[PDB]
Amino acid sequence: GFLDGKRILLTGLLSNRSIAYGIAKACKREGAELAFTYVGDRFKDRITEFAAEFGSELVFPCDVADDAQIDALFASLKTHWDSLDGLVHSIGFAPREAIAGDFLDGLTRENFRIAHDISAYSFPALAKAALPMLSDDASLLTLSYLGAERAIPNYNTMGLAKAALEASVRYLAVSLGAKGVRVNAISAGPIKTLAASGIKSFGKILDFVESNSPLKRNVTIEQVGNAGAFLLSDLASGVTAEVMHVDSGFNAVVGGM
Amino acid sequence: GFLDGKRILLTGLLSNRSIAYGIAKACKREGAELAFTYVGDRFKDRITEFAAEFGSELVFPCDVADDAQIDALFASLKTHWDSLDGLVHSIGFAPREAIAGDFLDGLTRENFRIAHDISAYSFPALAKAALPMLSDDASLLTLSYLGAERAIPNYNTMGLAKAALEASVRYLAVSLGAKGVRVNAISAGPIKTLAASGIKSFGKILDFVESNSPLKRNVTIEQVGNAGAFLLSDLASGVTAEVMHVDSGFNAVVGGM
Amino acid sequence: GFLDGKRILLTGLLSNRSIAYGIAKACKREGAELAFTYVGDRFKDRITEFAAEFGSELVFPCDVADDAQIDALFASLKTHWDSLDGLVHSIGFAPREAIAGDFLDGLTRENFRIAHDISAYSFPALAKAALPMLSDDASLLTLSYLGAERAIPNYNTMGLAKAALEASVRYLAVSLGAKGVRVNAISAGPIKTLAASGIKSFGKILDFVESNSPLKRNVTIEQVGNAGAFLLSDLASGVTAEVMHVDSGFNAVVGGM
Amino acid sequence: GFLDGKRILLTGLLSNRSIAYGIAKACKREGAELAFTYVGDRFKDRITEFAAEFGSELVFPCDVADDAQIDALFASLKTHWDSLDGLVHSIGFAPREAIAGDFLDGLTRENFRIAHDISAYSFPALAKAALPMLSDDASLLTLSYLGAERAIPNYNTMGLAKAALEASVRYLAVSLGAKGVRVNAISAGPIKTLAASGIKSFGKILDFVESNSPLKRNVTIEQVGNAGAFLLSDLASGVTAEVMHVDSGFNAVVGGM
Ligand SMILES: NC(=O)c1ccc[n+]([C@@H]2O[C@H](COP(=O)([O-])OP(=O)(O)OC[C@H]3O[C@@H](n4cnc5c(N)ncnc54)[C@H](O)[C@@H]3O)[C@@H](O)[C@H]2O)c1
Ligand SMILES: NC(=O)c1ccc[n+]([C@@H]2O[C@H](COP(=O)([O-])OP(=O)(O)OC[C@H]3O[C@@H](n4cnc5c(N)ncnc54)[C@H](O)[C@@H]3O)[C@@H](O)[C@H]2O)c1
Ligand SMILES: NC(=O)c1ccc[n+]([C@@H]2O[C@H](COP(=O)([O-])OP(=O)(O)OC[C@H]3O[C@@H](n4cnc5c(N)ncnc54)[C@H](O)[C@@H]3O)[C@@H](O)[C@H]2O)c1
Ligand SMILES: NC(=O)c1ccc[n+]([C@@H]2O[C@H](COP(=O)([O-])OP(=O)(O)OC[C@H]3O[C@@H](n4cnc5c(N)ncnc54)[C@H](O)[C@@H]3O)[C@@H](O)[C@H]2O)c1
């Protein structure tokens, strides 16, 4: 397959509906060797099973709020892999009130700080910590959403954090590019994941995308997974600093009128 | 003039080269009544003189790192003005290392936090605190830079923060818009201000814009000031959620080849 | 006013609902001297009355399909004005079928040709013909619509032509910029004009913008007019190659969900 | 491979440096069956050899200036293939003067017409003619350049045509999407092809991209080819109406300062 030999670390594989699961499944199909992170000792068994499904026993704890855990992740990974070819950042968080209702009602300094710390900062932070072991042709991928580009109801503080995240893709691409490393994002359409059980204006958004997207259907984690596998692969060696929409074309229309 | 009767609070007027000074001068010319903020007791005399130049004695301290000072600013302003028609956010900061050299070398969690706190969060934070006294036709303006949209050498962490800031313009526009309040940014070209004495890759950027911009010249604080006055005025009542480039058209070209 | 002394030629003033009428009214208020074009001998009396309303008797025929008429327009204007400070291009056309229903059903080579000839080519063609008499600080303005940027139902072939038009703003800005001339567009929201009595999916779009735009209201020709006057004026001397949205912020949201 | 069974028609394969050749080579590797167009009887032998290199004897004449040839192309193809799964539009032309020097000097109505007819109109025209035989999961791909988005010296009239072309990608995506057909573009970086021997400001642009792109290298037809194969494949079933940059990240920076 087109990822034969590539060794890829995936964050954010929480359930079999996680975007990271679709990415994991596609990467495994195309021949990659995988390793996985988790947060909280209670998910250790679950992530261990997922890893074994993908022929892997490489699982490591990493709460990205913690500098020591970020450093320890790569120290641990390095005892198995002398080099890293891929990194999937599929991590996000904002306090409930900061992604519900009116943008200002949910705005506080702490809510802003946490959302940007976990959803934006953590991507280049992982990149920096991984750098000494990145292969020259490594590829780093993060996940964003159209709320970074345009105001979408309820997305609120997460829209700000995703905008910073997309900017980080561009600055990372420049920092790491002379070495040969690529950095991209996928702007994925709505998919019913665990994170989506935050606000269900989600049902409304899901219906709207199905009705108004050019393909008249919502995307799947298989479709996002395949796009992800592509970006992580040498097939995409000409592509960096890109935010690729995998959203049935929804971003490109004015819908609903 | 086209701002007759409008009462406008300006942050960030540090010296007579400040972008806020150009905005202040243009607003005053067009008939606005002005008030000003400052940071640190040592600038109290200087900002007091600027205010008097613009026919004003309304000066208030406000370090935007401090919730109590943000709240106290509007409590103080309210003892003079029962309503606020305009707000100019012309504030930014990142630690020196976070806007010099390689993006990852200057990246730390604290540097990221501070840059986003001061340069991005503070805009909607001031908006929220001002809201109870905003007039229905009020207009809020912030200042951004092309580094939000594309990777520019040295801008680094500030590029991420400005991207979040531009997103905040869109979410603020939605939150405040049903009331009638407008929220916009100007993406200004390089201008030799006190903030510009950070990294002088500035001389290089300044030369490059002069050589490659469509108008073959750098912008002035008078030009940014006039665009600002326009946005704060009822002339711009159809315009909100916009990031307007005032940069001699530089953003629209691929230059230097 | 801020256009005192400026001499501005306006195309496209067809009725008192025309966007050009709002622009004309705003320019006249701010002190400009106006001249006007028309198409077809039957509109000569009507445009003559409009011109007199704005203190002008300067009216000239110009079908932009015709090279000879474009050249003759400026020869005629030059017998009155030795220089031209402003040009408003507020002209568009596509055959009915090319802006109704399915994009491919209405697509023919001739429909494509006509739409691009009249709606896109004519802007830089007028600029080129005007160039020998343009003042160094002249300002050229055209009108576009969000359908250039994103696919909007029914807009179809006009979306392609407006995309080419917006590109022409950028290339014109470079060509004319070293002289000092500025070139911009306003991307206006829907306004019930004569052109809007093409397809009334217009009623639907109008309702959708009112319901979903940040300001929760449609724009007016007064609002587009004032933005236009600003762009044509020295207030906007820092602004070129820009496509400014005057659409109540509608472009910046994902609405309707 | 990931295009096994897919039947793909490629236009624009002129020499072994053509972007279409890289696309052809990648599609063939991934298992596609190919057919090819050519213009002018003198290239019949050359295109016949290329086709045989890719295991094909399916070659057809098609000058896209001619409606009858467009219709005859698909009538001919249909005698071999009852369905079409992919279409690569890798065609462009503007008269020499319209892509050299100053934008207005090279601007004429005929130059504008020809550039838009051949470089923009021809894409949806081929789509419309192919439609009756397109498979439900078909994928249509065109090639664009950054000059559509920003003004690049010399690109001039072709910048306008590529902007219209990118808009056509969005309108085509909507028209064909309910059926299930996808439509995308690749915005490729400079590559030394036969078309590039127009103006050699090309050497300058090539050097500039190598020096300033994040990956510090120019793209290859292999890299554009692989991205193309991806877009034409079911791996990209979630992706439509997209303009994907394959340009070493050059679009995402401000370079050269
Ligand atoms: N589901 C969608 O509709 C959608 C659309 C566009 C983008 N995205 C993005 O895709 C990414 C994945 O989300 P998802 O949809 O797969 O939902 P998910 O719940 O399956 O994945 C979210 C992950 O974030 C991880 N996470 C949260 N806080 C963390 C921390 N402090 N340290 C480490 N990990 C942490 C969680 O463990 C979880 O694995 C997110 O960035 C999300 O923003 C999702
Ligand atoms: N000068 C340029 O080239 C340029 C270009 C584009 C955008 N901008 C932006 O314009 C805005 C104004 O900068 P400037 O160029 O006028 O330089 P400046 O130094 O004159 O203004 C910066 C202001 O930020 C204020 N500030 C910093 N920390 C603060 C805090 N904690 N609380 C309150 N105020 C604080 C300073 O007091 C100062 O008044 C900034 O947002 C800047 O990012 C500047
Ligand atoms: N009305 C809207 O909702 C809206 C929104 C965005 C942009 N626009 C654009 O604003 C501009 C003005 O349109 P409008 O809304 O004021 O409607 P309008 O009917 O009042 O103006 C259209 C003008 O195009 C002129 N025109 C058509 N063919 C011509 C030719 N061959 N030569 C010279 N002039 C010709 C007509 O004479 C008419 O004056 C157009 O470019 C339009 O695309 C309109
Ligand atoms: N080479 C680059 O740097 C570059 C960069 C970005 C985009 N592009 C685009 O990629 C596409 C392919 O160009 P290329 O670089 O492979 O150069 P090329 O010369 O190899 O391909 C151009 C093709 O256009 C075809 N063509 C011209 N007129 C035609 C007509 N009337 N009917 C049918 N075909 C016609 C030619 O036959 C030729 O095959 C073009 O659209 C071009 O604009 C090229």
Ligand SMILES: CCCCCCc1cc(O)c(Oc2ccccc2C)cc1F
């Ligand atoms: C807000 C209306 C539409 C949002 C749907 C798309 C979407 C985007 C996401 O970034 C997403 O993941 C998160 C959302 C909020 C907080 C944390 C995460 C991981 C989940 C999700 F369903």
Ligand SMILES: CCCCCCc1cc(O)c(Oc2ccccc2C)cc1F
């Ligand atoms: C990094 C190369 C080009 C940057 C020049 C434009 C510019 C943009 C700015 O946002 C600016 O103001 C700051 C920059 C860094 C940190 C804080 C501020 C206020 C100053 C400034 F000169």
Ligand SMILES: CCCCCCc1cc(O)c(Oc2ccccc2C)cc1F
């Ligand atoms: C297609 C749905 C929304 C379109 C509304 C906005 C609009 C945009 C326009 O560019 C416009 O003017 C024309 C439209 C088609 C053909 C010719 C013109 C001048 C009129 C008009 F009402």
Ligand SMILES: CCCCCCc1cc(O)c(Oc2ccccc2C)cc1F
């Ligand atoms: C104008 C300066 C940079 C242009 C380089 C990239 C490029 C873009 C193209 O679209 C291209 O193909 C054509 C260019 C002009 C006319 C016709 C074609 C096919 C060739 C080409 F080298």
